Design a binder for these strands. Sequence first.
DNA 1: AATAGGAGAAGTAGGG
DNA 2: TCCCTACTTCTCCTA
Length: 90
Amino acid sequence: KIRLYQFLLDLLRSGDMKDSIWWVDKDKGTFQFSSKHKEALAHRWGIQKGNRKKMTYQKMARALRNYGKTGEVKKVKKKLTYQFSGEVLG
DNA sequence: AATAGGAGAAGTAGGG
DNA sequence: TCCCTACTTCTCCTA
């Protein structure tokens, strides 16, 4: 399979869905979702995983919040903004 | 009212 | 026979 953070970084480094996700500072590993178009990106993540239900941003964020312990993805005080770690970027 | 944010509980998929 | 990993799903509260 493929992990959730690896899936978001690939979209960023392929320029796929520029309307749903984008860098805020490639150096700081900061990225942000689109308020009005994030669900389109959420739908893809669910289909690509073959999940039983339709993936939503709420369920995707619930999984992103787990990365706070390990450290692959940390939340930022900005709206819909997150940040990769220096390790994953490498 | 809208939107984002959070998380415990219990569950599935896949591998060992 | 069971557990680990990595989410997933549902529900409820909160800013």
